[PDB]
């Protein structure tokens, strides 16, 4: 809303997911923070003895189904206020939608770039994408330069 | 030299017998199961059933 974080689902595979996030304001209160699901249920992972920090990438796995993911599933995160917390903190969320076999093109130009660059540089196609740096506002000129 | 071209035509005949090299899948429906979950007695009963 003003700023909390970005929250990203990264599917590991069948029924295996991962949540990357980087919360901005990390000053107030967190004791064993929670992760919401469908906006009202399923504390997904309450196992952290750690308070996340400002501007830092994190990662935490969760196993779900793709069937609820086919619908809009409102996944939230809950930095736990110490004795009471369900949604009474600085709370944020996101929903997430999957639908297969749609818009094939916009991924494939990145595959084009890394395959041309992998055949050219002599490096393997894994290690070329492994040696590319991606920021959301990073121009591909600067990525080529790097 | 001519015997090296002989060698190439023999190995190309052998590749013609074998055909297309089977690409081993790695992205798969294989989840990573629990060893308790992987060794269930029902999991072999249902299979042989």
Residue A143 contacts residue A134 (beta carbons within 8 Å): yes
Distance CA(A128)–CA(A122), nearest Å, equals 9
Chain A residues whose beta carbon lies within 8 Å of the beta carbon of residue B32: 16
The H or E element that residue A95 is part of is strand A92-96
Say what the resolution is, in angstroms.
3.3
- CA-CA-CA-CA torsion sign (A69, A70, A73, A77): positive
Q: Which residue of B has its CA nearest to A15?
A: B31
* Sheet of A73-78, strand order: A34-35, A73-78, A92-96
Angle of CA points A96, A99, A104, to nearest 5°: 115
At B8, list the tokens: 């190439």
Chain A residues whose beta carbon lies within 8 Å of the beta carbon of residue B29: 14
Chain breaks in chain B (C to N over 2.5 A) after: none
Residue among A71, A76, A74, A59 nearest A17 (CA): A59
Long-range pairs of A80-85 with CB within 8 A, sequence gap ≥ 24: A80/A29, A80/A30, A80/A31, A80/A32, A80/A33, A80/A34, A80/A46, A81/A29, A81/A31, A82/A29, A82/A31, A85/A34
Distance CA(B49)–CA(B37), nearest Å, equals 19
- Beta strands A7-13; A34-35: pairing state: unpaired
Exposure string (b/e) for A127-144, b if CB count within 10 Å is 16 or more?
Answer: ebbeebeeeeeeeeeeee
Residue among A63, A59, A51 nearest A27 (CA): A51
Residue A20 contacts residue A62 (beta carbons within 8 Å): no
The minimum CA-CA distance between B27 and chain A, rounded to whole Å, is 8
* Elucidation method: cryo-EM
Return the SS3 of A85.
coil
Mutate to test the interface with A, among B26, B31, B34 (most CBs of A within 10 A): B31
- Beta strands A73-78; A34-35: pairing state: antiparallel
Distance CA(A106)–CA(A122), nearest Å, equals 25
């Amino acid at each position: 809303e003003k700023q909390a974080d970005y929250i990203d689902l990264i599917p590991q595979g069948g029924n295996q997911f991962l949540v990357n996030f980087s919360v901005k304001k990390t000053k107030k209160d967190a004791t064993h923070f929670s992760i919401g699901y469908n906006k009202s249920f399923n504390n997904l992972a309450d196992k952290n003895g750690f308070v996340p920090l400002a501007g830092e990438h994190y990662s935490i796995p969760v196993t779900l189904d793709a069937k609820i993911l086919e619908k809009k599933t409102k996944i939230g995160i809950t930095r736990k206020k110490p004795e009471p917390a369900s949604d009474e903190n600085h709370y944020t969320s996101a929903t997430f939608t999957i639908h297969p076999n749609a818009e094939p093109g916009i991924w494939l130009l990145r595959l084009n770039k890394t395959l041309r660059l992998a055949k050219v540089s002599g490096m393997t196609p894994h290690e070329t994408q492994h040696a590319l740096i991606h920021v959301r506002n990073d121009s591909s000129e600067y990525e080529l330069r790097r | 030299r001519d015997t090296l071209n002989e060698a190439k035509m023999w190995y190309m005949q052998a590749l013609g017998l074998l055909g297309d090299k089977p690409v081993s899948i790695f992205s798969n429906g294989w989840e990573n199961p629990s060893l308790s979950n992987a060794a269930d007695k029902t999991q072999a009963k249902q299979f042989h059933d």
